[PDB]
Curated annotation (Swiss-Prot), chain B:
Residues 23-265 form the Protein kinase domain. It is linked to Cardiac conduction disease with or without dilated cardiomyopathy: A cardiac disorder characterized by atrial tachyarrhythmia and conduction system disease. Some patients have dilated cardiomyopathy. CCDD inheritance is autosomal dominant. The chain holds residues 441 to 726 of 835 of the full protein. It comes from Homo sapiens (Human). This is Serine/threonine-protein kinase TNNI3K. Changing H145Y: In CCDD; uncertain significance; increased autophosphorylation.
């Protein structure tokens, strides 16, 4: 049921330099069907590969990664091919390169991300990214941005509770699209400040501070009042209080107009 | 299934083996998706029987946990019927003073502080026992329906139907997802116990005016707790504030809960 045009023989892929690595295997830069591509090569695990592919073959939007195909011939030859995006991750730009950005460049990125996410959330069968962060926002050289890496992505699912611990309640509850809005909020703050949320903490300390002790990255004069309000609602502890991505896109586009006019 | 029942039959001490024909079933005293709970009679002894409606794994596990139990603050297993899946039953002691839920919310009876603390302490001990076994057991369904009361004023934890033997990038995660990454720990019972302790002190069902799922929601997403009046003694309010800490790591162990409540009984 993966449309047959998306099937790939390994012979259709030219592998070049390695560009990423992890548990799954390796990511390579390469060439496929007359394009420059990123190829995610592989070494319970098969279900996750099949999910990712099922999701990648639904994608068609300029603010979301472009799928090229997958190789399914046998388990040792598994691979996912996408367009290569040469401008790097948003993470690198802000934290490693420390390129100084004007406010217009920042909003273009954040809007492009918000649009990609709006797209995903409003398909007939909605998609939750579940891993949205600055490592998974890639940038074109022109400053436009796309949402990448759908390895954690899932299709949206269609007495004792009164005495349940919150962490237990949360586990018996369905994972929603509003969890993507939370993560986005952090990315949006991260774009404006150019700082890693909770830079001084290791990942898990940071998550605990957010979940248990309500701490949020500090807002200041670095963030104008139309946006800062989106950030606050965006990372509300109650999912239902969080805005829809359609709302996020309009407000950021309005800000983008006014910053171009000024 | 046939292999699991036979293995269970083999590890289960002989006195616990029962035939469904040896059980007399009087009235219904408990309910659930699993089946029903009865008052009844077995070998001429007044007993409580859980009757049964994935279901074999559940039965083998519940019986397994039950025959490990040997502590006066925790339900006394009497036996099971494991003849075949159609006949699945679980027999325990019957306790004539009823559930804490009944006492507080149906009979609406008034208790003095000492009587309350004895209950709270017995529950705490029972949970301490479970949590400190060589193979810890987590209860997972601790509430006022599942705390039972002898007429001498002591209590036991009952219904082990939900019980189990205890076994990125995170920086950008939503709190309700970060929490989906950790499993059910012992500290989840402590939280449940906290509400029971508030329930005992006030006589009110936690979030009485909301439906369960809304109470859960208010507690998880909005971080709301039942109000802690000025009338509640400090050492107990301290236990509540900590016991239902949203941070599991910040909730006390039951041994500490026991220790603190025992002190109060020495001042009471
Ligand atoms: C392989 N397709 S994927 O599932 O979306 C995916 C997963 C993990 C990391 C990437 N990275 C990049 N992909 C493309 N271009 C780039 N330039 C700099 N990093 C990448 C992509
Ligand atoms: C069958 N044993 S069980 O699984 O622990 C169990 C589960 C659910 C409810 C009970 N009730 C009572 N059990 C004993 N005495 C009582 N007096 C008033 N209600 C009960 C017992």
């Amino acid at each position: 049921g993966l449309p047959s045009h998306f099937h790939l023989q390994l012979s259709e892929i030219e592998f070049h330099e390695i560009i990423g690595s992890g548990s799954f295997g390796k990511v390579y830069k390469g060439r496929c069907r007359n394009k420059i591509v990123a190829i995610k090569r592989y070494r319970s695990d098969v279900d996750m590969f099949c999910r990712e592919v099922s999701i990648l073959c639904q994608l068609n939007h300029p603010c979301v990664i472009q799928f090229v195909g997958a190789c399914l011939n046998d388990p040792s030859q598994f691979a996912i091919v996408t367009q290569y995006i040469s401008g790097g991750s948003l993470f690198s730009l802000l934290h490693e390169q420390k390129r100084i950005l004007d406010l217009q460049s920042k909003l273009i990125i954040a809007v492009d991300v918000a649009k990609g996410m709006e797209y995903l959330h409003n398909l007939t069968q909605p998609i939750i990214h579940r891993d949205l962060n600055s490592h998974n926002i890639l940038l074109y050289e022109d400053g436009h941005a796309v949402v990448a890496d759908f390895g954690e992505s899932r299709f949206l699912q269609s007495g004792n509770l009164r005495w349940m611990a919150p962490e237990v309640f949360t586990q018996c509850t369905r994972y929603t699209i509003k969890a993507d809005v939370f993560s986005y909020a952090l990315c949006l703050w991260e774009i404006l400040t150019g700082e890693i949320p909770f830079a001084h903490l290791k990942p898990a300390a940071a998550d605990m501070d957010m979940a248990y002790h309500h701490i949020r990255p500090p807002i200041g004069y670095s963030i104008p009042k139309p946006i800062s309000s989106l950030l606050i609602r965006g990372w509300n502890a109650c999912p239902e209080g969080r805005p829809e991505f359609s709302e996020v896109v309009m407000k950021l586009e309005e800000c983008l107009c006014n910053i171009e006019l000024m």
